[PDB]
Design a protein around this ligand. Structure first.
Ligand SMILES: [Cl-]
Ligand SMILES: [Mg+2]
Length: 177
């Protein structure tokens, strides 16, 4: 089919710094998983704090997606911000699904407040994402670090604030196309 199939990987920050704004991260994902969820699309739900976890493996089944959203709702944000581990679990599923032979999109929800080695590990891991043929988007939360999100996303054009709401979602939907 001329219609391009898309694999969407949500890499969600569940650290302590976003604990009071976790509803904003869930709302964005819940809105995106229904407003722009055409057939032949597949989604994955990944969260990260001090450890990364695949809450929803890559699937297009509407039932498992719905149950993945229910699991995101019960998430208790706490811990460090190891976004490279979250990106790494997306890269593992991308390579498994076919790597360069897939059309994979990574959407990271975070405040970009990284510490220690995570800035370099996150930038390196995102380059692995781009080497696998994936397009990386960064959706900033709270008073997010714009410069940090630009060094992770493909460009400043792929960095958007979550406060933009439906307009920001639409901008990301039009950007994916
Ligand atoms: Cl934190
Ligand atoms: Mg954080």
């Amino acid at each position: 089919s001329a219609r391009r199939a898309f694999d969407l990987y949500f890499v969600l920050d569940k650290s302590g710094s976003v604990a009071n704004n976790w509803i904003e991260i869930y709302n964005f994902v819940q809105q995106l998983a229904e407003r722009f969820v055409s057939p032949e699309m597949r989604l994955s739900f990944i969260v990260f704090s001090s450890q990364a976890t695949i809450i929803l493996p890559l699937t297009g089944d509407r039932g498992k997606i719905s149950k993945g959203l229910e699991d995101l709702k019960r998430v208790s944000p706490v811990g460090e911000t190891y976004i490279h581990e979250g990106l790494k679990l997306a890269n593992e599923q991308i390579q498994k699904a076919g790597g360069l032979k897939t059309s994979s999109i990574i959407i990271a929800l975070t405040d970009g407040k990284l510490d220690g080695l995570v800035p370099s590990y996150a930038e390196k891991e995102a380059k692995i994402s781009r080497s696998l043929g994936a397009s990386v988007y960064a959706v900033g939360v709270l008073d997010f670090e714009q410069a940090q999100l630009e060094r992770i996303a493909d460009s400043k054009e792929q960095v958007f604030p979550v406060k933009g709401g439906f307009q920001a979602l639409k901008g990301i939907i039009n950007s994916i196309l």
